[PDB]
Amino acid sequence: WIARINAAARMNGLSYSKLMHGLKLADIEVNRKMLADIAIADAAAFTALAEEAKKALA
């Protein structure tokens, strides 16, 4: 779960620790492993929730 999601996060150049850190910074979602399950075909869910984390670190 976490390995493939830091694989796609690292494909966006993002590291798991600051991503998750942006997830605690982030919304009501602290949802973990379904958020790992978006490894299939989710630039919208994956990179957009990544942008939610970008406005959570921001």
Partner: protein
């Protein structure tokens, strides 16, 4: 409930090719991330039996940014099974001759030591001063940094 996992790769694998080089790049910092790509660990599709073994290409492999006097005190070893089997390839030596196992033995130290690790680890693509060969397929140059 039960099968929320997904391999999505364990038959339908990918095959991609990467010229990866810097003429002088340090050995460890190149080595573990080219290890990561030869896993395909950076690819978002990991399976413990993924076989995302990347075509990890290196050319022009003359130099490590060699910190300290490592070309004088790196010295390697080996042991033939004949008793008293010390045979040592040493530090700066055979770098200038054949800097191949100067890399991929250390990437054997990188890899998961198993049949898949020896699969892609024994599917490296290694050139030391070259413009390599067989660009019939499509190669792509990967990064510079240690990321």
């Amino acid at each position: 409930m039960m099968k929320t996992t997904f391999m999505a790769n364990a038959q339908n694998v990918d095959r991609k090719w990467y010229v990866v080089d810097a003429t002088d790049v340090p050995l460890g910092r190149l080595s573990a991330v080219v290890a990561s790509v030869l896993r395909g660990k950076n690819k978002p599709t990991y399976t413990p039996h993924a076989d995302t073994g990347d075509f990890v290409i290196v050319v022009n492999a003359e130099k490590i940014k060699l910190t300290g006097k490592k070309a004088t005190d790196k010295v390697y070893y080996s042991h033939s099974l004949h008793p008293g089997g010390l045979k040592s390839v040493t530090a700066g030596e055979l770098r200038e001759k054949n800097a191949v196992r100067l890399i991929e033995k250390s990437v054997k130290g990188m890899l998961p030591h198993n049949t898949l690790g020896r699969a892609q680890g024994m599917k490296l693509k290694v050139f030391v001063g070259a413009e390599h060969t067989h660009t019939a397929q499509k190669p792509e140059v990967l990064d510079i940094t240690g990321l």
